[PDB]
Amino acid sequence: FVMWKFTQSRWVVRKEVATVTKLCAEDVKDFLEHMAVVRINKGWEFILPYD
């Protein structure tokens, strides 16, 4: 689901992902850190640019 959200939009909301997947904050944080980084005032952005 996280990868699908990233493919649909470059910006993913941790709160929305958590509310949808009903998962815990630590698991959501691990899933987001495995493939993205934190950006202020924008949420989570993909670590690599559009190739």
Partner 1 sequence: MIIPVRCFTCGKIVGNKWEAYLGLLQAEYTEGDALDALGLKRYCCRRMLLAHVDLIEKLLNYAPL
Partner 2 sequence: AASQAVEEMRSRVVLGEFGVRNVHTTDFPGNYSGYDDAWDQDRFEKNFRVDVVHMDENSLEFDMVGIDAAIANAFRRILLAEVPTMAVEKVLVYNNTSIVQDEILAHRLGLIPIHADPRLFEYRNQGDEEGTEIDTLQFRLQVRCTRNPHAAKDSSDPNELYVNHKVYTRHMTWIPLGNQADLFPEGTIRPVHDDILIAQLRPGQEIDLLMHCVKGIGKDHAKFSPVATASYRLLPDITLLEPVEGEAAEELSRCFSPGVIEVQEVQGKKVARVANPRLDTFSREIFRNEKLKKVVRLARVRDHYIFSVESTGVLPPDVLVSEAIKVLMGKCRRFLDELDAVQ
Binding stretches for partner 2 (CB under 8 A): 22-24, 27
Nearer to partner 1 by C-beta: 7 or 41? 41
- Who's near 33: CB < 8 A, 6+ residues apart? none
The Cα–Cα gap between 41 and 24 comes to 23
**Which of partner 1, partner 2, none lies near 40, with the C-beta cut-off 5 to 8 A by kind?**
partner 1
CB nearer to partner 1: pick between 1 and 19: 19
Using CB under 8 A as the binding rule, the residues of this chain from 4 to 43 that contact partner 1 are: 14-15, 18, 25, 40-43
